[PDB]
Amino acid sequence: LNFGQVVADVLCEFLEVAVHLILYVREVYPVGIFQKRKKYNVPVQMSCHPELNQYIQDTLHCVKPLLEKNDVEKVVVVILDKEHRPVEKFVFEITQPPLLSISSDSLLSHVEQLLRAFILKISVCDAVLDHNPPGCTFTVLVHTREAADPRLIPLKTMTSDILKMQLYVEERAHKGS
Amino acid sequence: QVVADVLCEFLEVAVHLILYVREVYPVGIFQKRKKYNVPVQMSCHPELNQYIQDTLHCVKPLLEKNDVEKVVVVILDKEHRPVEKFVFEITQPLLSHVEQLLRAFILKISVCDAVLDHNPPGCTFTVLVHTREAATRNMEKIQVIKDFPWILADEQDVHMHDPRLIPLKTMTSDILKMQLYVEERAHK
Amino acid sequence: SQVHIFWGAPIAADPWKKIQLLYSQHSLYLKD
Amino acid sequence: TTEVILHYRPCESDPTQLPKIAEKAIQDFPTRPLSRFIPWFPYDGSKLPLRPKRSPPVI
């Protein structure tokens, strides 16, 4: 494959973990379906309901080409309540630099630590989150990018810069009954 | 002792679950169990299991009387130094209600392994009970069962270097207020 | 700039059917 | 005005009604201020926690 696809591919792996984690934490779905699996040598809670896993996989299967083309502004994970009102949203914003100077080897190595740093943002963000109304569910939004002297070949950089997406959680003032 | 009865059952689960997650003890001893409607690994070892039940039993009288300010499960290495602290700040101001509120805490205990740095081999644990009043009342009150005595902890026992904060969860119920956070030593 | 809403989550060939609509003033309506 | 592309499954009984319902998910909603974590009782240094004399078996 090429760099673009290996970056895009990794992104989603993080996202697959994040959605499962956000479901576990928020108690959207009963916890029994969850078994602990190791992704990139990180203990990630993952699900064992094939109906729920398939929904997530297909979703990401449709996001991955949109990332391979830098057409993703952000991907949201709206938790909705009984009347399909958003209760809270976990916004993951993707900052994709045009240059994309960094090579993969730097990216491949910082993958586990990056996944660990991701879990922190999600895990430390919901500590202060109140409890969601009972009997909930979720959706996933994706917003395509709005707008766009080397010919090519920008100098090599080995930084971990802009290879992570930062999520800002939004909590409804009145979640509900 | 309306509330305090619930907290000990809850604290016992966390102490057991905490060990499993940080790998304080080898996994052979722990047995999957459904506590608080979550799958958690409790221990099936006698020498340790009584130590646990005996510690918390000594805390209830302070919880019945709300002499308790926080309860800290500390993980200690071979050199008996502090590495990670599981602080449980507790403020006390329908029966199956709270039993659902606390469930959040188990979930966040069980996902801390990804975010905490791996601890050193052969670790041992302990509990710190911070009383609300520094008074003697609690130090004589806390030693209900004999043959299991409490003391004061010195700086050597409690002081940790390069501590980092990993918040886990905060709840603000009408009947129980509680906070859970972990202080981690930067270099282990 | 478009937003793709994915639907169908577990209750409280081709994988996805699609409906194309437009967003105007806090309401959703179908294409021309 | 921005283009939406609702994706739904063949299982759904009502494809036609998805737009008025999903109209709810896209809507922004009044956000609660960002609460930040702060320990109620900070590390004290003058108050000593009570530690049991006994120690774990550590088998």
Numbering used by the authors:
A (entry chain B): 9 to 156, 183 to 211
B (entry chain A): 13 to 105, 115 to 209
C (entry chain D): 5 to 16, 33 to 52
D (entry chain C): 2 to 60
Text from the published report:
To elucidate how shieldin complex is assembled, we constructed full length REV7 and the N-terminal REV7-binding domains of both SHLD3 and SHLD2 (designated as SHLD3(1-64) and SHLD2(1-52)), co-purified REV7-SHLD3(1-64)-SHLD2(1-52), and solved the crystal structure of the complex to 3.5 Å resolution. Unexpectedly, the crystal structure shows that SHLD3-SHLD2 binds two REV7 molecules, one in its closed (C) state and the other in an open (O) conformation, which are characterized by the conformation of the safety belt, thereafter we name it as C-REV7-O-REV7 conformational dimer. Compared with C-REV7, the αC, β1, β2 and β7 of O-REV7 show obvious rearrangement despite the safety belt. As a consensus REV7-binding motif PXXXpP, RBM2 of SHLD3 interacts with C-REV7 in a canonical manner as RBMs of REV3. Similar to C-Mad2-O-Mad2, the REV7 conformational dimer uses the conventional HORMA interface centered around αC helix to dimerize and the dimer interface is mainly connected by hydrogen bonds and electrostatic interactions with a buried area of 1670 Å2. Although RBM2 of SHLD3 interacts with C-REV7 in a canonical manner, the structure also shows that 38FXPWFP43 makes extensive interactions with C-REV7 despite RBM2, and these residues are all highly conserved across species, which indicates FXPWFP may be an unrevealed C-REV7 binding motif and exerts important functions. We superimposed the structures of the C-REV7-SHLD3 complex and the REV3-REV7-REV1 complex, which shows the FXPWFP motif absolutely occupies the binding site of C-REV7 for REV1. Our crystal structure demonstrates the structural basis of SHLD2 recognition by the SHLD3-O-REV7 complex. β1 of SHLD2 forms antiparallel β sheet with β5 of O-REV7 and parallel β sheet with β1 of SHLD3. β2 of SHLD2 forms antiparallel β sheet with β1 of SHLD3. Thus, β1 and β2 of SHLD2 form a sandwich with β1 of SHLD3, while β1 of SHLD3 and β5 of O-REV7 form a sandwich with β1 of SHLD2, which are mainly connected by hydrogen bonds between backbones of β strands. Interestingly, the structural alignment also shows β1 of SHLD2 occupies the positon of RBM2 of SHLD3 in C-REV7-SHLD3 and the N-terminal region of SHLD3 displaces the safety belt of C-REV7.
